Amino acid sequence: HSVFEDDLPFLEFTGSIVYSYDASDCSFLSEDISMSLSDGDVVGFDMEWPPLYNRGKLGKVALIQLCVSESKCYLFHVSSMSVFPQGLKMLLENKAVKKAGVGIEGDQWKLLRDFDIKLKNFVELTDVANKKLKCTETWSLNSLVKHLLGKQLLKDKSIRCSNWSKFPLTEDQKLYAATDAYAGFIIYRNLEILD
Numbered sequence: 001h002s003v004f005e006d007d008l009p010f011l012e013f014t015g016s017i018v019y020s021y022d023a024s025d026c027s028f029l030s031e032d033i034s035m036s037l038s039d040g041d042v043v044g045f046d047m048e049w050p051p052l053y054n055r056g057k058l059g060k061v062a063l064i065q066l067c068v069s070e071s072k073c074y075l076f077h078v079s080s081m082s083v084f085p086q087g088l089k090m091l092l093e094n095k096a097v098k099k100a101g102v103g104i105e106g107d108q109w110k111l112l113r114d115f116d117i118k119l120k121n122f123v124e125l126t127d128v129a130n131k132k133l134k135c136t137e138t139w140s141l142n143s144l145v146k147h148l149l150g151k152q153l154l155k156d157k158s159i160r161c162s163n164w165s166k167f168p169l170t171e172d173q174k175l176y177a178a179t180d181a182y183a184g185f186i187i188y189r190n191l192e193i194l195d
């Protein structure tokens with residue numbers, strides 16, 4: 001195999017991982033995020049859900065991740081919350097904060113389906129890459145991480161496809177989920193600086 005096929009080092013977030021599984025805690029956390037951002041700021045977005053199917057559709061969203069800086073990421077374990085946090089809902093529906101990710105449009109649906117929350121102002125990293133990189137490629141979060149960072153995303157299938165609704169989350173689940181939203185934040189940031 002070519003050099004381009006070599007196994008690269010794993011992208012691993014090493015900043016602060018804030019784990020929340022209580023509604024009001026999550027809403028106040030959402031306000032902290034809003035107090036630390038200005039209109040236009042972008043955050044890495046992503047979510048997880050259990051394996052088993054539910055009445056003909058993917059298991060209901062159990063975790064939502066938001067990476068707000070290069071040193072901090074939030075894990076909102078909604079599957080363990082009595083009600084969906086109002087401050088998070090408002091945060092996610094606030095067009096003042098952009099959410100970056102890959103396959104994000106699909107997250108919007110399902111988000112609407114599972115929680116009746118309308119994700120507002122989301123950016124599909126694939127479109128941003130093709131724009132700033134002056135190309136027309138079919139990106140994945142992994143291929144973007146490889147191309148721009150020289151790393152690959154953690155890939156233990158048993159972790160990535162684990163029971164995300166199982167409480168509490170394991171340190172591995174927390175690292176995987178956190179890093180995925182982190183990639184989203186770093187990829188957007190780097191792509192945006194280009195000109």
Ligand SMILES: [Mg+2]
Pocket residue numbers: 046047
């Ligand atoms: Mg995902």
Ligand SMILES: [Mg+2]
Pocket residue numbers: 046047048177180
């Ligand atoms: Mg993920």
